[PDB]
Ligand binder design. Sequence first.
Ligand SMILES: CO[C@H]1O[C@H](COS(=O)(=O)O)[C@@H](O[C@@H]2O[C@@H](C(=O)O)[C@@H](O[C@H]3O[C@H](COS(=O)(=O)O)[C@@H](O[C@@H]4O[C@H](C(=O)O)[C@@H](O[C@H]5O[C@H](COS(=O)(=O)O)[C@@H](OC)[C@H](OC)[C@H]5OS(=O)(=O)O)[C@H](OC)[C@H]4OC)[C@H](OS(=O)(=O)O)[C@H]3OS(=O)(=O)O)[C@H](OC)[C@H]2OS(=O)(=O)O)[C@H](OS(=O)(=O)O)[C@H]1OS(=O)(=O)O
Ligand SMILES: *[C@@H]1O[C@H](CO)[C@@H](O[C@@H]2O[C@H](CO)[C@@H](O[C@@H]3O[C@H](CO)[C@@H](O)[C@H](O)[C@@H]3O)[C@H](O)[C@H]2NC(C)=O)[C@H](O)[C@H]1NC(C)=O
Ligand SMILES: *[C@@H]1O[C@H](CO)[C@@H](O[C@@H]2O[C@H](CO)[C@@H](O[C@@H]3O[C@H](CO)[C@@H](O)[C@H](O)[C@@H]3O)[C@H](O)[C@H]2NC(C)=O)[C@H](O)[C@H]1NC(C)=O
Ligand SMILES: *[C@@H]1O[C@H](CO)[C@@H](O)[C@H](O)[C@H]1NC(C)=O
Length: 423
Amino acid sequence: VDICTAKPRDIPMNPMCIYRSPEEDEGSEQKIPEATNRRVWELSKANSRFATTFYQHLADSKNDNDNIFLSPLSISTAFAMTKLGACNDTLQQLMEVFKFDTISEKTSDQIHFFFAKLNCRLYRKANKSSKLVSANRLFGDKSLTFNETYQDISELVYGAKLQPLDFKENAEQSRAAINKWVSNKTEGRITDVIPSEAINELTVLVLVNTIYFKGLWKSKFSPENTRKELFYKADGESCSASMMYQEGKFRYRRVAEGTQVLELPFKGDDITMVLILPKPEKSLAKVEKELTPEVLQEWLDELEEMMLVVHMPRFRIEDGFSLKEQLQDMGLVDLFSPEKSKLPGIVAEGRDDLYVSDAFHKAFLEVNEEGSEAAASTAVVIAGRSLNPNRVTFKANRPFLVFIREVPLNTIIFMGRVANPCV
Ligand SMILES: CO[C@H]1O[C@H](COS(=O)(=O)O)[C@@H](O[C@@H]2O[C@@H](C(=O)O)[C@@H](O[C@H]3O[C@H](COS(=O)(=O)O)[C@@H](O[C@@H]4O[C@H](C(=O)O)[C@@H](O[C@H]5O[C@H](COS(=O)(=O)O)[C@@H](OC)[C@H](OC)[C@H]5OS(=O)(=O)O)[C@H](OC)[C@H]4OC)[C@H](OS(=O)(=O)O)[C@H]3OS(=O)(=O)O)[C@H](OC)[C@H]2OS(=O)(=O)O)[C@H](OS(=O)(=O)O)[C@H]1OS(=O)(=O)O
Ligand SMILES: *[C@@H]1O[C@H](CO)[C@@H](O[C@@H]2O[C@H](CO)[C@@H](O[C@@H]3O[C@H](CO)[C@@H](O)[C@H](O)[C@@H]3O)[C@H](O)[C@H]2NC(C)=O)[C@H](O)[C@H]1NC(C)=O
Ligand SMILES: *[C@@H]1O[C@H](CO)[C@@H](O[C@@H]2O[C@H](CO)[C@@H](O[C@@H]3O[C@H](CO)[C@@H](O)[C@H](O)[C@@H]3O)[C@H](O)[C@H]2NC(C)=O)[C@H](O)[C@H]1NC(C)=O
Ligand SMILES: *[C@@H]1O[C@H](CO)[C@@H](O)[C@H](O)[C@H]1NC(C)=O
């Protein structure tokens, strides 16, 4: 039956390869909420350590006046799926990079199971206020013979059926179909995850994750109070920007160095949007430099309901980029190397030369008077073309950090930086 009601012994599944136990975060922090499996919560902490760390590298590789938008959950889910077929040093690297080894022995050895559990809690909860769904998938070459266990564990644990496409002969048309499926799952918001020419004739498998969020604000903004105003980019140019207005009671706190932290709850209170604004003339860099899940937890736990005036733009951002460079810097070497990569659990027919050529991410965010919409997707390509993509996106001034979190479980669904609010 269900992995949602099941327990480890119910579904005997343990993957092919297993990682060693290192030479237990000393002094467990953040006591778990009620009716919540210890193990799930630990996984939630693992992903949050990846979220902050990944952002750190990401924000370091862009101009400070750039927009950054991602869904670290999606990235984690997709790599965990990828992890199924990993072994030896490729698996250890994934384990460390994603923070999967920074938790207890049992949880560490049962990543996928707990991810299914954690996902059951995220998307399959009986008291929906806001919509939060997810869809996973495997797209593999039509002529190959994949490992049956691999399929089964991936369908059972992540809901990822395996769709056969003709990479070998119709490469270009396969990609489009993958993007069409991704567009479908994200309500036409993420239409182009995989970039032209990335998939080719030597392409074996494409692992995709999709996350979609749409929530109504708990305290709406009146459109008759929304107004226009010029926004001055760093360069010199300006653009129009519809700035919304509202007055009410909201969790807020003025922190160290004058940094303001504001919380905007979606109906239900299960999911909220946190905003982090540096002091008027203060750079975001320091805050971004000292961004650990501990510090974040401190800010949120200091917040005190207060009556205030909220001013925020009606906007839409979108980020699209490749994760190869960043992950490598962060420790993920083997997985992308055609000589050292070791993924022996994907294809039945002993073709053990696989390597992830490139992996793409793409997010979308829209904020308005009614609520907030967000979508995202990760696509990992096994054996295609490593291409060096888009090295230029608009630089604008005075950015704020945005976070779309799930409260009970403390999961960072979406996270980023809005520099250019003009649409
Ligand atoms: C070397 O040491 C490490 O490895 C060994 C060997 O493990 S191995 O066999 O994999 O090799 C570990 O030992 C095993 O682990 C035990 C453990 O408790 O983790 C134990 O697991 C099995 O039994 C437990 C308890 O059984 S119970 O039926 O009496 O409860 C079971 O855990 C329970 O799961 C419940 C669950 O349904 O979720 C929890 O309920 C809460 O959460 C639910 C929903 O969660 S979620 O929605 O967030 O996902 C919630 O729903 C309403 C409940 O409502 C309240 C919550 O309960 S509440 O009261 O807290 O609110 C239970 O409480 C939270 C939870 O008990 C702790 C476990 O299920 S699993 O955790 O999902 O896996 C089950 O696993 S099993 O299927 O594999 O059996 C094993 O005994 C059978 C034990 O094996 S042994 O017998 O050989 O020793 C070491 O674990 S430990 O240190 O002993 O804990 C492990 O150490 S470590 O990894 O270094 O920590
Ligand atoms: C297809 O993939 C499956 C994995 O999904 C491959 O089998 C896996 O192989 C390892 C060892 O070869 C198995 O682990 C074993 O677990 C036992 C538990 O008793 C342990 O004692 C052993 O020392 C070892 O660790 C793993 O369980 C296993 N199978 C499953 C169902 O998980 C299989 O080899 C792949 N087939 C092809 C053709 O590639
Ligand atoms: C993305 O894929 C989904 C299918 O997986 C497509 O949604 C499907 O669309 C039809 C209508 O276009 C849905 O049926 C509708 O049912 C409602 C009531 O439930 C009714 O009022 C409508 O007139 C229609 O009968 C169908 O259920 C739905 N499938 C799922 C699984 O949701 C969607 O169109 C796809 N998008 C694109 C662009 O292809
Ligand atoms: C590591 O790799 C070799 C083959 O490259 C394999 O024979 C060995 O079993 C692997 N070790 C572990 C612990 O998986």
